[PDB]
UniProtKB/Swiss-Prot annotation, chain A:
Keywords: Bacterial microcompartment, Carbon dioxide fixation, Carboxysome, Chaperone, Cytoplasm, Photosynthesis. The lineage of its organism: Bacteria, Bacillati, Cyanobacteriota, Cyanophyceae, Oscillatoriophycideae. The gene is rbcX. It comes from Picosynechococcus sp. (strain ATCC 27264 / PCC 7002 / PR-6) (Agmenellum quadruplicatum). It is found in: Carboxysome; Cytoplasm. Homodimer (RbcX2). Interacts with the exposed C-terminal peptide of RbcL ('Glu-459-Asp-468'); binds 2 RbcL peptides per RbcX2, stapling them into an RbcL2 dimer. A slightly longer peptide binds with a higher affinity, but no long-term stable interaction with RbcL is detected. Contacts a second RbcL monomer via its peripheral polar surface. The keyword Chaperone applies. This is RuBisCO chaperone RbcX. An RbcL-specific chaperone. Required for assembly of the RbcL8 core, acting downstream of the major chaperonin (GroEL-GroES). Acts on newly folded RbcL, has a transient dynamic interaction with RbcL and is eventually displaced by RbcS. The central cleft of the RbcX homodimer (RbcX2) binds the C-terminus of an RbcL monomer, stabilizing the C-terminus and probably preventing its reassociation with chaperonin GroEL-ES. At the same time the peripheral region of RbcX2 binds a second RbcL monomer, bridging the RbcL homodimers in the correct orientation. Changing V73A: Assembles about 50% RbcL8. GO terms for molecular function: protein folding chaperone; protein homodimerization activity.
UniProtKB/Swiss-Prot annotation, chain B:
It comes from the Bacteria. This is RuBisCO chaperone RbcX. One of its GO terms (cellular component) is carboxysome. Keywords: Bacterial microcompartment, Carbon dioxide fixation, Carboxysome, Chaperone, Cytoplasm, Photosynthesis. It is found in: Carboxysome; Cytoplasm. Its main location: other. The keyword Ligase does not apply. Changing E30A: No longer assembles RbcL8, no active RuBisCO formed. The chain holds residues 3 to 109 of 134 of the full protein. Homodimer (RbcX2). Interacts with the exposed C-terminal peptide of RbcL ('Glu-459-Asp-468'); binds 2 RbcL peptides per RbcX2, stapling them into an RbcL2 dimer. A slightly longer peptide binds with a higher affinity, but no long-term stable interaction with RbcL is detected. Contacts a second RbcL monomer via its peripheral polar surface. GO terms for biological process: carbon fixation; photosynthesis; ribulose bisphosphate carboxylase complex assembly.
Amino acid sequence: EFKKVAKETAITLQSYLTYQAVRLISQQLSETNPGQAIWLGEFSKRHPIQESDLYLEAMMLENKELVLRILTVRENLAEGVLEFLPEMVLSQIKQSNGNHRRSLLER
Amino acid sequence: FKKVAKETAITLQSYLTYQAVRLISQQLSETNPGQAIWLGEFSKRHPIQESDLYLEAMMLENKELVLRILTVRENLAEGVLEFLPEMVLSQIKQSNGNHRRSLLERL
């Protein structure tokens, strides 16, 4: 149960950081190769990013450069961002909890 | 990578909320099935992805539960956050590893 939550949250995160990496490569490409940009928005239609491994495995058939870029960018975001997540989220949850508690125990 | 961190922490905050609602939903299916059904179709009306809007909407309907979610989401966060950066960083490196190897050796 703590185990099931952790394992599910990590999968979610790995998936989300893939999504962030595609968003980031999309800004880059919209400024440099808008061909391949309109393209990527369209590939994202036929395949849900939420299934990250299936999204990449499917892309591999169509556009091998762009997969490798995605794997590189997602790892960079991961190394930059992950270790900051516990303070920020734990701290945000306290601020949020506090606001909602007040809004409920003032009405 | 700060905008990515902020957007990642908010997704994470909201995901731990979801996960809190999932545990509370399991307890209710046992002790109070009427609420469990309620909570189920509440969750189809208000997307948990927007955590604060969801607790705010729920406030008009069931305030005991909102308070319960907050408590539970904080416990979960305190329990599970410290574990996440290693798991995500390690799953990604491992996953990059298989996709790279599949692409390069197999074509």
